[PDB]
Symmetry: D2
Subunit: 259 residues, 4 copies
């Protein structure tokens, strides 16, 4: 199979990558970073996120795998010590694929983005004020620091820090959380995180200022003269190559409770 390997670019990760490439040389495996079928990321979740965005135009043709040299690995299944076992298993085509939901962001002045973790919106530094419209229905006028829309796998990231729920990635949904909402006599938001199914469309519309800092995972990005920001669950999915059982809730336990 065609494969490539991205590295965090430190000594540890670069050497592990060189060793895996040497190991793949002993099988029918071609290194191709233009049209790979397998993308191996060696580093942290940041490296993994970069791999995803490198190859987001061929998501349906790629299965992703992560090796963690950190630190945490929510998108790592593998420790560096098991790199040889992985080469072997991967060479013999010994895996089933698992798909996770993604988030489509549309910015209208249209620019469209795909997020694996989340997309957030904040001011250019003045007040944030936006109207939140759900399936063409006006839901609330949000005043505060910003808003975050998360995929299920993203719920353990920024979402978690904002008080969001952790959602199993078999659920096809997206989750909206508030950053520092203003609530008083005058000014009212729901307060609570909101979980939306497939085919629901959440639209953010400016009230005064039309300049926003928009993030998509690790990318952040001042957008000027914005008319609308639209969120929905993508029709596209990320596919992981999976080689043993490592359930989501065990990954959550390992990352947050104890390992």
């Amino acid at each position: 199979m065609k494969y490539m390997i991205t590295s965090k670019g430190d000594e540890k990760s670069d050497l592990l990558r060189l060793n895996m490439i040497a190991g793949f040389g002993e099988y029918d495996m071609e290194y191709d970073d233009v049209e790979p079928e397998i993308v191996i990321s060696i580093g942290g979740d940041g490296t993994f996120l970069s791999a995803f965005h490198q190859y987001e135009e061929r998501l349906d043709e790629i299965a992703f795998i992560g090796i963690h040299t950190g630190h945490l690995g929510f998108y790592a299944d593998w420790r560096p010590a098991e790199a040889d076992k992985l080469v072997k298993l991967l060479a013999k085509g010994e895996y089933q694929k698992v798909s996770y939901p993604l988030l489509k962001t549309t910015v209208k002045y249209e620019a469209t983005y795909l997020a694996l973790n989340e997309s957030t919106v904040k001011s250019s530094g003045g007040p944030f004020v936006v109207d939140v419209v759900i399936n063409d229905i006006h839901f609330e006028r949000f005043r505060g620091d910003g808003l975050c829309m998360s995929t299920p796998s993203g719920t353990t990231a920024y979402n978690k820090s904002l008080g969001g729920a952790l959602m199993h990635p078999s659920i096809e949904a997206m989750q909206l959380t508030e950053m520092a909402s203003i609530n008083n006599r005058v000014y009212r938001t729901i307060g609570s995180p909101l979980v939306f199914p497939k085919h629901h469309v959440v639209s953010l519309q400016p009230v005064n200022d039309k300049d926003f800092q928009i993030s998509v995972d690790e990318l952040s990005i001042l957008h000027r003269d914005v008319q609308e920001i639209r969120y929905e669950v993508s029709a596209k999915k990320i596919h992981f190559a999976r080689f043993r059982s490592f359930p989501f809730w065990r990954r959550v336990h390992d990352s947050f409770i104890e390992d």
Copy 2:
């Protein structure tokens, strides 16, 4: 069709019920509170919850409708002034059915319960301490006041007060929230609400004391010599009779933002 009407039992609700029965007398509609096909609740959500539990052995044969004389009505679609329009529409079979997910609780010493909103667990007054087991995997030792497991329609109730996410009821899931968790050097919980798909089983197991106060919606219930408490999304669903568009997110807006 066979129908019945439950009332909150105050003057307003009883008279509305008598008037609807008189109105149904002008159509091919038989009052039968043993085997109804339509159950009309007149009161608040408490009255509605009682109606549901009255008839939970024939959920697949019944479509529910709520008239609110309160106050709030998350399970009300109807104001008292529209009672005549409802009699008319209902008589002519002019409706599509909408189904919402339910929560199965199993208490092992087996007693099984069905919740429309939630089931909660707290101590008999001493410390609460339970082990939380997800699909046979030990996830955490919870120390605090209690735990709440919510259906999607229940997410606006007790769940919301505990910091839970609001979930659209088209999502087949259940949501676990903490009550006053202890977190320190020693003692660790996830903190965050957790959303589980269909077929996931969350099990609570005692550590010291085996006596718990368990609630299922409005029913609460000291259980003695408990071995296990098991939660999963039910295979059963509640069916509503629905006569116009009144989207979930608009109901949420109306109940929490402004009406």
Copy 3:
């Protein structure tokens, strides 16, 4: 000096107590559990809390010291291994006293209680609903699970679990936190914890049911036919005997961040 020692009552604590008493026998130190000037607690914070309540009628005549055999010790300064150094330092009168604020609870049908950590109020099992009156001014109608009023040293306990602020115990104040407040169109609470100075009086008044479960630290206590529950910062203080520097914020760091 007159002293006594309370023990958690396990093997470890009882033996440490016997050894300290033997060590005190070599100085001018009289064991007197009726009118002690020093009260040594050996166990956890629960043991310490019991010691405090044992002797709350002679708080101005007593200095308290805690040895932790647990676990956590917010009211422990001492590990079991330093028990000999403590006997020595204490025998030679080698200490300055530090005072912490206390909370006065008055229950009117008057019963008055003193809390070192907190006093809480919940239902007898039905709805909790109370009117919150601050210095004779009606502030809110609280609907939810209950309320907690904390001393500064108590802010690390139940208060912390309810989202309360941690307050340095040099601040003469009390802090009110909510348990699962209901907030919607109809029903409104402040949401936020509230910190009150000395001489402010917070009064809770029943709306329907007049039966409440009231806790004062580890004591809990169904009160019937309640007219009022009144909170204010006590004029009385707890005195600790203190032998080296162990700042509050370092105790907090050690108990919650890492030790």
Copy 4:
């Protein structure tokens, strides 16, 4: 007395100001915006905050008064309709002064600032990571969006939105709240807001990046090559001219519960 009046600068506020000046012309009152003894603000809390910062070098020589043409007025005592009664009462020297605590911010590369509401720190857009040092004791490594340090009167503002406690302004203290803290296996913060007495010093120190966006009330301000950010309760206080009883907790009730 020497006085001046700042206006929000809309039609309503400018005309009210012109009318008050005309009314003051009938008493022994000199308009002096260089060395006033009374500073009247007409607008919102934003206008009030600007007045405070206009005159922060002569805080001990000035008593402040606010008229609200909004909206909310936490620093307003007065509605526009009572402007005449105020001119009269103020002319006759008919008032007692009330003082509120302030927050000193020191930024070391020293620049010092005084806040009436709060000072916050966030990244220049990369990760925020800072070491939190309390009275020279290392307390935590904070990873997240930022931190907020609030005065007692500021606790109803940004602080409240971040989950902070509301504190009565007779308490001489400052309150530190987190913005979106990261908490996992690796990375740990206290979570809870922290309340510090007078004479406690909280210091923030950079870990990697040394560029921060620092706010002081409405002023925000990229600081480059930062070595330290230091917070303590100021020795300086803001004085209000006060003409009738309008207790803090009633102001809170009116702004957040109902008016």
